[PDB]
């Protein structure tokens, strides 16, 4: 201020701005044959936990 | 001046189209409805009348 003689003015405020893109689309899909869910010895459940944790 | 904090507006609510009233199917005949309920056609048959003799 003192060097522009004790002249003023106003400057024009602005911005910066980022975008957060909601881009990512990720999937799971299987099949469990209903041959196989009779013929094995237990609960298939664990591959419904499995793609869960894959995601 | 503000380049990212001026934000866009989007209705809610879609435009839907301007259509033509649509009239012809209450103008016409629909009484081969209840025997066309079935098959994929009606035959309709007219008399021919007799000729009047000299």
């Known amino acids: ?37 009779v013929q094995v010895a237990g609960s298939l459940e664990a591959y419904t936990r499995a793609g869960a944790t894959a995601l | 001046a503000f380049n990212n904090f001026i934000p866009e507006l989007w209705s809610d609510m879609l435009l839907e189209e301007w259509t033509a009233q649509t009239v012809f199917a209450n103008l016409v005949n629909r009484e081969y409805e209840g025997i066309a309920s079935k098959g994929n056609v009606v035959h309709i048959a007219g008399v021919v009348a007799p000729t009047v003799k000299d």
């Open chain 1, 1 to 37: 201020y003192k060097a522009a003689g004790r002249q003023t003015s106003a400057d024009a405020i602005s911005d910066t701005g980022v975008d957060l893109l909601i881009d990512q689309e990720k999937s799971i899909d299987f099949l469990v044959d209903d041959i196989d869910r």
